[PDB]
Amino acid sequence: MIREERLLKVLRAPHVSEKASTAMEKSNTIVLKVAKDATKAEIKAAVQKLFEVEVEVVNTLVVKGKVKRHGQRIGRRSDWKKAYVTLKEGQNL
Amino acid sequence: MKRTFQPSVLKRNRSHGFRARMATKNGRQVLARRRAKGRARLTVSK
Amino acid sequence: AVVKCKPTSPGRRHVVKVVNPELHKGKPFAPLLEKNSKSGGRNNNGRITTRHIGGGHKQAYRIVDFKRNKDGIPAVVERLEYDPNRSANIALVLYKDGERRYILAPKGLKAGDQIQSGVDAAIKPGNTLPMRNIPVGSTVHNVEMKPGKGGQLARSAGTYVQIVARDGAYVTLRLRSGEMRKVEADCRATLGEVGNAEHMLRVLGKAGAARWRGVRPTVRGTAMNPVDHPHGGGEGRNFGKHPVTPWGVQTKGKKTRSNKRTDKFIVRRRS
RNA sequence: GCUCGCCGGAAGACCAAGGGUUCCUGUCCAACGUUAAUCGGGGCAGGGUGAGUCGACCCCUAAGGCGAGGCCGAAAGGCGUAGUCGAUGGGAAACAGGUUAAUAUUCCUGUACUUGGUGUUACUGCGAAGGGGGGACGGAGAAGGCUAUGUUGGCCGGGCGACGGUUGUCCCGGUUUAAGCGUGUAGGCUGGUUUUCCAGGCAAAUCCGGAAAAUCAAGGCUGAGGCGUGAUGACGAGGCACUACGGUGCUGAAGCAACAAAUGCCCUGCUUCCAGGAAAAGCCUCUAAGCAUCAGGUAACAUCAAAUCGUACCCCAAACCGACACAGGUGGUCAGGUAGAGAAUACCAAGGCGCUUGAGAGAACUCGGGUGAAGGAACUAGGCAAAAUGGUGCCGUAACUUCGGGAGAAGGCACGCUGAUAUGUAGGUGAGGUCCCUCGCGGAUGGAGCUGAAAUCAGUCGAAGAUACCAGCUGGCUGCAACUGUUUAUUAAAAACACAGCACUGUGCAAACACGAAAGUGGACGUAUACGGUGUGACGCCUGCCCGGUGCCGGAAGGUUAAUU
RNA sequence: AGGACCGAACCGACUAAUGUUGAAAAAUUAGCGGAUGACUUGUGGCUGGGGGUGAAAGGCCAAUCAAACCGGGAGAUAGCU
Ligand SMILES: [Mg+2]
Ligand SMILES: [Mg+2]
Ligand SMILES: [Mg+2]
Ligand SMILES: [Mg+2]
Ligand SMILES: [Mg+2]
Ligand SMILES: [Mg+2]
Ligand SMILES: [Mg+2]
Ligand SMILES: [Mg+2]
Ligand SMILES: [Mg+2]
Ligand SMILES: [Mg+2]
Ligand SMILES: [Mg+2]
Ligand SMILES: [Mg+2]
Ligand SMILES: [Mg+2]
Ligand SMILES: [Mg+2]
Ligand SMILES: [Mg+2]
Ligand SMILES: [Mg+2]
Ligand SMILES: [Mg+2]
Ligand SMILES: [Mg+2]
Ligand SMILES: [Mg+2]
Ligand SMILES: [Mg+2]
Ligand SMILES: [Mg+2]
Ligand SMILES: [Mg+2]
Ligand SMILES: [Mg+2]
Ligand SMILES: [Mg+2]
Ligand SMILES: [Mg+2]
Ligand SMILES: [Mg+2]
Ligand SMILES: [Mg+2]
Ligand SMILES: [Mg+2]
Ligand SMILES: [Mg+2]
Ligand SMILES: [Mg+2]
Ligand SMILES: [Mg+2]
Ligand SMILES: [Mg+2]
Ligand SMILES: [Mg+2]
Ligand SMILES: [Mg+2]
Ligand SMILES: [Mg+2]
Ligand SMILES: [Mg+2]
Ligand SMILES: [Mg+2]
Ligand SMILES: [Mg+2]
Ligand SMILES: [Mg+2]
Ligand SMILES: [Mg+2]
Ligand SMILES: [Mg+2]
Ligand SMILES: [Mg+2]
Ligand SMILES: [Mg+2]
Ligand SMILES: [Mg+2]
Ligand SMILES: [Mg+2]
Ligand SMILES: [Mg+2]
Ligand SMILES: [Mg+2]
Ligand SMILES: [Mg+2]
Ligand SMILES: [Mg+2]
Ligand SMILES: [Mg+2]
Ligand SMILES: [Mg+2]
Ligand SMILES: [Mg+2]
Ligand SMILES: [Mg+2]
């Protein structure tokens, strides 16, 4: 099994948006910010162990950082990973 | 009119990339000169 | 046979073709095939070292037994096939033990004829014997220079070699170029002339035919500037020079052979 | 929102490259946009890219690169063996419907498929760094069978018309469904089997190759499409009811047949030609060392796994290459209607646009076009430009000629619509039904229905019927180059270069020659019917004299002559 | 069958006009040539400067070519302006 260290490090934040709300209300899917090098197996194991819920499947994607400008200063935000983890229809987290 | 610069990332990396500069001692001297100058970008690699 | 084409177009008006209906219309024997990519006259430095080579039709190499070092097993001629890599036709022969080999087809060969290699082989075309077991005055091809190295002389279509005299451990040969040469009597030779003798009767007819064979156009040296050929320059047609190579060596009559190592085996020059 | 105009083999849609947030939402008009701006590819903030099956990664290699040792080189280094990388190529597997403001073959539904690991059971000879098969291959041509798709009829829903007519041979719209599974067809390829022996496949092999016997003569391999299922499902013209006026929910008829038909599929097929047309792995098969009532293999079942990265958006362009929101350039895929041979062209469909300054006036002059009295090259360096010709079928066509051409030589006639031949013909397709047989996607017959040129005769309208777009000017003499091609990117396309052919000359293979301090490499895995250099330049008739000069080839009596001694 | 014929795509570039501080540091418009081949094109690779490549124009080698570009000898030298 994956150690408690990775399972406590991989999850970062719960994503919030209209799409996330729609997914949580229709498909029993919660959207989370996870570690950049967190695999789907680690995400699933951490969601099961740290939330006491039951997971069906995990979908991941990397969000690219947006180039910005802080008053003529070029600056790029950091890339991060988005997780679409689906529960087994009876968890209602 | 077909101009002279036809971009191709793979060809760019193969011709002027970091590992192409490190493959010969003259490329290594190119990297040393650029490090001495203080360039913020040694190669076209990134 | 040689066939004159009909002048339905300017490119066909002069084409003379060589067609043998006895050549295998199918595919070559697969296990005796290899790839040979084209050089283009470029050496391992990437520079052109032989001019006027490039393009042409894709070709696969047919492995040909120039050594003929299977003594005592008879073989039968299966079929004659076209060979892109040479001017002569090659023959599929089947040895008694179930072994298949490619040989240069001599004149008069046909499917169903037998061949044999060895000291005791019968003197007849297609049979390979050491030249100390081959009579004087006979016609041979695929002649060896060093015992076991392989045939290297009289290999082109229609070419042959005559054994003119025998003495000691060497035998004299009259090469197709005309010179008299000495070779060890242990070297093997194949009886008979190489086939496809009509190969020199063909006419390409057009520039494209020459381009299909890997040849690129030749530019006359007098047609360019002096910066890149000794023959260059002039206002109009002007020569006023002794003809030379593109590198300055006189190219009309000057001998260029220099090999003292092999001078002892040349009885007479080709004259 | 209603009209008008433009593209529609693109100015529509989708991949690749390249770019990187330009994509969607709210907000703002300082700067940017060649004008204004409430608008924006502009500013600010937020949101958006979901994969076991797509691509990368991965296994395998091409050209080529790097290259342990090695060879060579003042040093730096060069070449290269064993290997290892290298796609533009080979290798497992997913389709249809629905959903967002922005993603979908990735989310949801339905129905599938692939590989690998384990465990249980059953049977059992497994095993590679090796052998064999296969993967696995060109150009052109033709036919047959299909499909995408289209048209028409039938069916279902709706309609009865702002102006004369419109219950009918009328008008409008819809008539759609995949992968997978089963069947194994039109078609192509090939004799099947069972023994025995063997100088071959580095050793061996039951495998491949060879040989000899008997035996049966139909077995095997491949293969579009069609049909059943998938699917009593989905979708579906509309309708009902709301509305935050963008849209949203429920319900839902018919969903057939005939004909035509691809450049797409069968097809890596077949035929033919010479210029003779990758590699390796995955895959199948054999065994060696080894293990041998343990492993391992096969088969059924069950369970587990398929990770990581990309996925927004532009993509013939305002986002890529051109300093620009630049009349330029940019590889591949899709391919409706009428007319048409056509992907030409004209007008349209789906779809997308009116090109980021306008408003007036109606001078010269400039640019792009239309027409023109009489004349018709008188212009001019020159018919430059313009004008003119232009289709199909049929008749007809000279000198010359290398007998192929010239030739579309020249020149001429017909062409629209209607009716009849014939309620639509010759022809194509082809159902029901009759019979038969290897029983099925079968064979003979049968001709319903659909479709359907070209011709003849008669009539008829206009000035004109190849009516628009589209679409050769022709002939005669003559120089040069035989011809097709190539060239001064950006003032020269030609008589110049090349060319097939000819000749001379060199070269015997460790070839000549060329690139290289060298090792090596090309020439060439070629061998004098070959290769290199030079000149000429199809073909026909031909190519005459001079070796004194320069060069080259051969010779070595004599003269002279280096280093050396 | 054909370096065959007519003719789109595609590849080019013969004529004329426009443009010449251009829409464009080589284009547009109307005509024009080849269009199954010595064809064209995508991707990747190789040849390096007295060198490459060149169906040969001293052509091309990143809008530069009778000797590329960048840096260095270097403040070359200049009886000249
Ligand atoms: Mg993903
Ligand atoms: Mg830059
Ligand atoms: Mg040559
Ligand atoms: Mg020649
Ligand atoms: Mg010249
Ligand atoms: Mg010179
Ligand atoms: Mg003169
Ligand atoms: Mg003179
Ligand atoms: Mg921005
Ligand atoms: Mg304002
Ligand atoms: Mg403004
Ligand atoms: Mg937008
Ligand atoms: Mg914006
Ligand atoms: Mg999924
Ligand atoms: Mg290699
Ligand atoms: Mg190397
Ligand atoms: Mg070493
Ligand atoms: Mg590899
Ligand atoms: Mg690839
Ligand atoms: Mg989208
Ligand atoms: Mg159909
Ligand atoms: Mg075609
Ligand atoms: Mg997209
Ligand atoms: Mg604009
Ligand atoms: Mg543009
Ligand atoms: Mg193009
Ligand atoms: Mg058009
Ligand atoms: Mg006016
Ligand atoms: Mg005017
Ligand atoms: Mg006019
Ligand atoms: Mg007039
Ligand atoms: Mg008049
Ligand atoms: Mg007149
Ligand atoms: Mg006059
Ligand atoms: Mg005058
Ligand atoms: Mg004119
Ligand atoms: Mg005109
Ligand atoms: Mg009529
Ligand atoms: Mg004259
Ligand atoms: Mg000519
Ligand atoms: Mg020019
Ligand atoms: Mg020109
Ligand atoms: Mg050699
Ligand atoms: Mg042609
Ligand atoms: Mg050109
Ligand atoms: Mg044009
Ligand atoms: Mg022509
Ligand atoms: Mg043409
Ligand atoms: Mg000149
Ligand atoms: Mg230039
Ligand atoms: Mg110089
Ligand atoms: Mg100095
Ligand atoms: Mg100075």
UniProtKB/Swiss-Prot annotation, chain A:
GO biological process: cytoplasmic translation; ribosomal large subunit assembly
An annotated GO cellular component: cytoplasm
Quaternary assembly: Part of the 50S ribosomal subunit. Contacts protein L29 and trigger factor. Might also contact SecE and probably does contact SecG and SecY when the SecYEG translocation complex is docked with the ribosome.
UniProt function note: One of the early assembly proteins, it binds 23S rRNA; is essential for growth. One of the proteins that surround the polypeptide exit tunnel on the outside of the subunit. Acts as the docking site for trigger factor for Ffh binding to the ribosome (SRP54) and to nascent polypeptide chains.
The keyword rRNA-binding belongs to this UniProt entry's keyword annotation: yes
Gene3D superfamilies from the UniProt entry: 3.30.70.330
Keyword Nucleus: no
HAMAP family: Ribosomal_uL23_B (MF_01369_B)
Keywords of this entry: Ribonucleoprotein, Ribosomal protein, RNA-binding, rRNA-binding
GO molecular function: rRNA binding; structural constituent of ribosome
Name of the protein: Large ribosomal subunit protein uL23
Swiss-Prot record, chain B:
Keyword Nucleus (UniProt): no
GO terms assigned for molecular function: structural constituent of ribosome
Keyword line: Ribonucleoprotein, Ribosomal protein
GO BP term, example: cytoplasmic translation
Entry keyword annotation includes Ribonucleoprotein: yes
InterPro entries per record: Ribosomal_bL34, Ribosomal_bL34_CS
PROSITE patterns found in the cross-reference section: RIBOSOMAL_L34
Entry GO terms, CC: cytoplasm; cytosolic large ribosomal subunit
Domain of life: Bacteria
Subunit and partners: Part of the 50S ribosomal subunit.
HAMAP family tied to this protein: Ribosomal_bL34 (MF_00391)
Sequence similarity: Belongs to the bacterial ribosomal protein bL34 family.
Name of the protein in its database record: Large ribosomal subunit protein bL34
Species per Swiss-Prot/TrEMBL record: Escherichia coli (strain K12)
Taxon lineage: Bacteria, Pseudomonadati, Pseudomonadota, Gammaproteobacteria, Enterobacterales
From Swiss-Prot, chain C:
Consequence when changing H229Q: Loss of peptidyltransferase activity in reconstituted ribosomes. No change in rRNA binding or assembly into ribosomes
UniProt keyword terms in alphabetical order: Acetylation, Ribonucleoprotein, Ribosomal protein, RNA-binding, rRNA-binding
Pfam family, one: Ribosomal_L2_C
GO MF assignments: RNA binding; rRNA binding; structural constituent of ribosome; transferase activity; zinc ion binding
Gene Ontology cellular component annotations, sorted alphabetically: cytoplasm; cytosol; cytosolic large ribosomal subunit; DnaA-L2 complex
Residues bearing PTM N6-acetyllysine: K241
Biological processes annotated in GO: cytoplasmic translation; negative regulation of DNA-templated DNA replication initiation; ribosomal large subunit assembly
Record keyword DNA damage present: no
Region (Disordered): 27-52, 220-271
Biased composition (Low complexity): 38-47
Membership in a protein family: Belongs to the universal ribosomal protein uL2 family.
Function noted in UniProt: One of the primary rRNA binding proteins. Located near the base of the L1 stalk, it is probably also mobile. Required for association of the 30S and 50S subunits to form the 70S ribosome, for tRNA binding and peptide bond formation. It has been suggested to have peptidyltransferase activity; this is highly controversial.
Quaternary assembly: Part of the 50S ribosomal subunit. Forms a bridge to the 30S subunit in the 70S ribosome, contacting the 16S rRNA. Interacts weakly with S6 in one of the 3.5 A resolved structures. In pull-down experiments interacts with CedA.
Remaining remarks: This protein can be partially replaced in vivo by its H.marismortui (HmaL2) or human (L8, from the 60S cytoplasmic ribosome) homolog.
Protein name in the entry: Large ribosomal subunit protein uL2
Source species of the chain: Escherichia coli (strain K12)
